[PDB]
Design a protein around this ligand. Structure first.
Ligand SMILES: *C/C=C(C)/C=C/C=C(C)/C=C/C1=C(C)CCCC1(C)C
Ligand SMILES: *C/C=C(C)/C=C/C=C(C)/C=C/C1=C(C)CCCC1(C)C
Ligand SMILES: *C/C=C(C)/C=C/C=C(C)/C=C/C1=C(C)CCCC1(C)C
Lengths: 222, 222, 222
């Protein structure tokens, strides 16, 4: 299409589609109820991302937001994705370590706040206020990372896989607020097409990369 | 009103209203926690459907979608209904057979995908792409039906009621993609008023019919 | 700002912000998984309310709804708040008394209905029909209050705290339909700025007041 970022939306669509079918095939067989849990969560994440990448690709998940006196192309479908996929990702971590329900409700709700205030910031028409919402969302993100490091003595295999995915998570998720801040939603330093490339690489790694690590682990079986 | 389909929206409103009050009365009494579960789920389904039928009846759940160069009347409130009532229906089936949580999360999330891509398809302004979303949604539907048949040795009474509702479910839910495809959201072969009649008959059967079968069964008690 | 109600939106923002940080600090320490549950729920409630008060304050959570041939300023962000915070409040009550899951699903779903039909009523452009949605929502509210009084012999300490919060809940929640009815969403008897003051006082009491009562109780510990 006439949108230079179309290629990264097409590649993301394809890669999420392929990871979904890979994980669906892979989880064929599985009878351990525990493993079943991780397969369901982990397959749903890129299936949802597939649909929202495709909706961006076809033009549906894009809207024009006037701010700084200009019509800014905002991809809102990313927040409908993340709204569901980022808690699912947290549930995978949480189940690995047998978290208490209170800690899981803390994580999912901080996550909701993170994404929803990101969305409000994305659609806010007063430029300066966009970054107030960014800050609040970032603070929710930092709470989540805090809990992942300080909020949890288990089978060695659980701990090891949990520690790797936790590290993957902090590194990748921490990049999203930066991208947003310097990209088209924020200061407009980085053009939309490079931004969309950046988010494609992060999303595939955080979903399909993460899930390959998890689902090859015997940490997921009782 | 000046909408010929108004009569089927009024009858659906009434029938869902009546089934809700019937099931509410009926579940009066119930102390078995298990039965309580099925009554809550099963009463909520047509109560939600009541509200969305009424919102269509009064004009609120209808929007104009330009496509094939025309203003197409799309009832979006059906997807707000289904978004909640179709997972609830799946939960009823799932609890009957004591499904593993992983299988329940698979079903609810495939269902979310089904309805949400149905909604995107319903509101898409590029005619051809409407049917890409239809296909993806249908494939989610076929996954759900697959799991209901191949994803689950229990008390004979559970199995029997489970098998009847499962059959009811596959037959009725399978008709929805057809109706959408030949009706006003899709190829426009069947006029909106007949379409609305068709969806009224399916919805009442899938909700109030289904629930009468379930809630008369002693399969719902421990 | 040029909106007279701005001061009560600023004070509500501040008070919800402060209660969130108070409860977050307070729950620092807590290891009892049960207590952890109540802290998560109870801290999330005013954190969510903080974000929606701030979105009203900045103008984002406000839209113009034409009815009775006039552009009525409707704060829709209250329903995005309540959609999540009112079930959370019910979950706090429900967990205190060890409710059956069927009763919890009844409460959360009646609550969803309550808020969602409130939202539909708030955005309905046919004046008379606004109050049909009000009535349906009120009837959901009365079901919830009914269940809180007649739907539940435990540790004396649980019962006592449960009875106080239950009383707090019925009194405060019952005022909301009245405010809506006489205020800008309804009959327009009470100006928007006084209405916004009223909702600020109720919300802070129902969230931050309620939570102070709960989280000082040893009813929350196993
Ligand atoms: C599947 C995609 C994932 C794991 C995406 C994660 C997204 C975030 C961690 C987003 C964070 C943001 C903030 C902390 C600040 C404001 C903007 C956001 C929403 C991009
Ligand atoms: C209470 C109403 C029920 C049980 C409705 C079920 C609706 C479906 C099974 C819808 C399926 C659709 C597709 C598979 C394709 C695209 C359009 C839909 C959403 C009508
Ligand atoms: C945190 C805020 C709380 C506890 C707010 C509760 C709101 C209600 C109980 C709202 C009830 C309403 C009706 C019963 C009728 C129509 C309008 C509503 C949504 C204001």
């Amino acid at each position: 299409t006439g949108r230079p970022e179309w290629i990264w939306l097409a590649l993301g669509t394809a890669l999420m589609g392929l990871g979904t079918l890979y994980f669906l095939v892979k989880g064929m067989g599985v009878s351990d109820p525990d493993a079943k849990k991780f397969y369901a969560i982990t397959t749903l994440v890129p299936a949802i991302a597939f649909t929202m990448y495709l909706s961006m690709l076809l033009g549906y998940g894009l809207t024009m937001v006037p701010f700084g006196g200009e019509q800014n192309p905002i991809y809102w479908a990313r927040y409908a994705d993340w709204l569901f996929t980022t808690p699912l990702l947290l549930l995978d971590l949480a189940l690995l370590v047998d978290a208490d329900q209170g800690t899981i409700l803390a994580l999912v709700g901080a996550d909701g706040i993170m994404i929803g205030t990101g969305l409000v910031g994305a659609l806010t028409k007063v430029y300066s206020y966009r970054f107030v919402w960014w800050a609040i969302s970032t603070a929710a993100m930092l709470y989540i990372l805090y809990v992942l490091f300080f909020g949890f003595s288990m089978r060695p295999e659980v701990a090891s896989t949990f520690k790797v995915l936790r590290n993957v998570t902090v590194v990748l998720w921490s990049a999203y607020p930066v991208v947003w801040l310097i990209g088209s939603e924020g200061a407009g330093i980085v053009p939309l097409n490079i931004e969309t490339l950046l988010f494609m690489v992060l999303d595939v790694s955080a979903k399909v990369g993460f899930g390959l690590i998890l689902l090859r682990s015997r940490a997921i079986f009782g």
